[PDB]
Amino acid sequence: STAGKVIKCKAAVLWEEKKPFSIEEVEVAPPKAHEVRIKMVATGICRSDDQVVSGTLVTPLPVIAGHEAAGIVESIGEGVTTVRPGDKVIPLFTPQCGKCRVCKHPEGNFCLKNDLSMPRGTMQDGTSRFTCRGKPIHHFLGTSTFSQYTVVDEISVAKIDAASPLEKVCLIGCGFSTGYGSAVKVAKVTQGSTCAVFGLGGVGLSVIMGCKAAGAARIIGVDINKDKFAKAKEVGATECVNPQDYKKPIQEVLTEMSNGGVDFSFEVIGRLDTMVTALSCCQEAYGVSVIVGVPPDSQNLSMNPMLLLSGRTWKGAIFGGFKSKDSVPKLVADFMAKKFALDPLITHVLPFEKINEGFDLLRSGESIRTILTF
Amino acid sequence: STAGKVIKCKAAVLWEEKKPFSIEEVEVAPPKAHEVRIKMVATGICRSDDQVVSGTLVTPLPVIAGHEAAGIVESIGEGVTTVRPGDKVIPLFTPQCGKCRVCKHPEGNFCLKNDLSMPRGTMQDGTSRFTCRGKPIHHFLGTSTFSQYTVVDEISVAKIDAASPLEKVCLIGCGFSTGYGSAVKVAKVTQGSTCAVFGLGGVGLSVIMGCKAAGAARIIGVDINKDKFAKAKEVGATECVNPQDYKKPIQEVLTEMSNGGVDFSFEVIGRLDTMVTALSCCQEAYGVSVIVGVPPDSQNLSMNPMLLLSGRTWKGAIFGGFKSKDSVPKLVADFMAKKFALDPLITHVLPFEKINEGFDLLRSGESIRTILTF
Ligand SMILES: NC(=O)C1=CN([C@@H]2O[C@H](COP(=O)(O)OP(=O)(O)OC[C@H]3O[C@@H](n4cnc5c(N)ncnc54)[C@H](O)[C@@H]3O)[C@@H](O)[C@H]2O)C=CC1
Ligand SMILES: NC(=O)C1=CN([C@@H]2O[C@H](COP(=O)(O)OP(=O)(O)OC[C@H]3O[C@@H](n4cnc5c(N)ncnc54)[C@H](O)[C@@H]3O)[C@@H](O)[C@H]2O)C=CC1
Ligand SMILES: [Zn+2]
Ligand SMILES: [Zn+2]
Ligand SMILES: [Zn+2]
Ligand SMILES: [Zn+2]
């Protein structure tokens, strides 16, 4: 009988860029029509949430960040049909309305109801469910998972297996699905191909998992932090290279290593220069390069379109190209059936109250995924 | 007999950039091992040849330009197995060695023996078969068709049907195949899709022919020269737009016209700005944009990689992605079988001696293809 009532609970509020989060009481309004209020159980720390703190991923502040999570439905608003109270759910930072031209397209996943392209930091109705110190607080990507309770639109939540371990499957809400799908769905990596993966964090490791699942013969991990190489090899990298070790640009190194360029490359960092390097290192006639990393806000890259004229394909994707609400429950079912592993991404576990310590671990280079438990 | 002897003949020599072609006597050496000497019958004037004159497509000078042609084999060197004297042939500006990693790849066509990436202006053996006034003259793309006779490597020639009309099928050597293949093979335009085509010259009109052949429902032609619109509609454009008629950037106009972005766009001009505009006007989640136009040498474009992160695909191709020696004879057979039309591309037919007048028709906006006859 919190149904229909304001919930007071602890959240991690970001009042200002480049500051620690503030763990303090917020008010969470009850769900309106076609909204769902969720008791959070676990949430991952994704680099994207750090990019909000840095101001390189722009969204209105003050904000409740967090987008990679799982929890249990506390209550549903009028007209909700796809979840019920007590269901295990993953919030969907890329919604799936099922009605727009993108949701109807066989390839498209970047649903037109998204709050990513022109971020408002609201619910679909352009309002906020969060108050803190009597002030309205923004949502983030329609999820806001750094809170003991959040409210999401129905098109931004999926029901998952009632027996799911939420402290693992939260990663299906961002890192795992994004990297894995970038390899298997967006690039469509082929058997016996040579792949290069720039960035060996939680998302790059999931790209290597996808490239190994698709049968790549060679998977070259690229990182300036050599501490990341051991885990990259554990999940399928065949060799790792640190650009800092070489006199020549790493695109020339990777072209040499692959006897004329790789089949597939992935940028999984968020830098303009590595997006161009990753395109250049794929074979000039038939290579494919996928951008996964989030670039610094409003900045343009410079490149020579002759890289494309010879035959390269350049593409990007959100959330591994997966239609979110269709895909997430299937990915959970596949995890439950041991079709892929999440433990290699989880390097640290902390209670929610130690969220700043978890951000310090990511910023130091020491962690892949820290899972926060409520 | 001419076999085994130097031929003295008329060619159009380009001694330096931004000068008219010089019609004069050249000496054409006999073919060496694995070379083919061709009597030219017809050659088209392609914008790429004008870009050599402008200095925006860099190749060593002085040069015999011309790459879109057909002729008859005069003689063969030792070891030639794929053509014989008397055969009708089309020179291949993109070769097909059949042995390199690209030629062996199911998608690749940019054969590693090409003279496009790092142009030397020679035969495969690094020498020239042309002299003029006692000076060696460079080849262009392994073809050099602005000459009564040329010598090509065997991997740069295809045998075609003995009954084909060379004054039309010369366009299968460049413009038609480039535009048609960019639509049907590189973009893989789908039935009922909406396409935008930037540039309505000979290659852009061939892109429209391919989009119509693939069953596109809407084909929007874009040109600053409204005199190009009537012929674009004859070969399948459903509507034409001139960016100069609008207050808003044309990417915004096309996104509005297509109710949120086109399925397929094509840049068929050669400008950095229209390459970015064409990418932007394709739907952000599932759009495909193909670069066909040749950009100005050594210039980089500037773009926001968020255009790709949402889901766009950006790709370019040489020669419509066709593997050149396999494809050109089949395209000629398909033309003989009335599967497509070439007459709509031909606006002017001039004697070879009128090459400069042909180029002035292209520069003035008055022609699509001028065919020069020997
Ligand atoms: N497209 C999408 O849907 C999603 C994109 N993102 C983005 O993916 C990127 C990766 O996220 P995570 O794996 O969580 O981050 P992470 O920070 O854990 O991993 C990035 C890795 O890149 C390495 N790196 C940094 N600079 C480098 C350089 N110059 N050259 C080579 N390696 C370098 C770092 O050492 C680190 O190991 C971030 O930009 C993030 O915002 C994350 C998930 C969703
Ligand atoms: N990728 C490949 O294998 C090939 C590429 N090319 C390139 O394709 C391009 C087109 O070649 P052609 O059709 O022979 O050229 P063309 O000059 O006949 O056609 C170009 C059209 O673009 C239009 N145009 C110029 N500026 C424009 C602007 N700012 N906005 C909109 N329209 C504009 C012109 O009015 C003209 O109708 C050239 O860059 C050529 O070098 C041609 C053939 C093979
Ligand atoms: Zn939708
Ligand atoms: Zn994320
Ligand atoms: Zn080859
Ligand atoms: Zn051409």
Swiss-Prot record, chains A, B:
The modification N-acetylserine is found at S1. Its EC number is 1.1.1.1. It holds the Pfam family ADH_N. NAD(+) binds at S48, G199, L200, G201, G202, V203, G204, D223, K228, V292, G293, V294, F319, R369. Zn(2+) 2 binds at C97, C100, C103, C111. An alcohol binds at S48, H67. It is an enzyme of class 1 (oxidoreductase). Zn(2+) 1 binds at C46, S48, H67, C174. InterPro entries: ADH-like_C, ADH-like_N, ADH_Zn_CS, GroES-like_sf, NAD(P)-bd_dom_sf, PKS_ER. The keyword Metal-binding applies. It catalyses: a primary alcohol + NAD(+) = an aldehyde + NADH + H(+); a secondary alcohol + NAD(+) = a ketone + NADH + H(+). GO terms for molecular function: all-trans-retinol dehydrogenase (NAD+) activity; zinc ion binding. Binds 2 Zn(2+) ions per subunit. Gene3D superfamilies: Medium-chain alcohol dehydrogenases, catalytic domain (3.90.180.10), NAD(P)-binding Rossmann-like Domain (3.40.50.720). GO terms for cellular component: cytosol. Belongs to the zinc-containing alcohol dehydrogenase family. Class-I subfamily. This is Alcohol dehydrogenase E chain. It comes from Equus caballus (Horse).
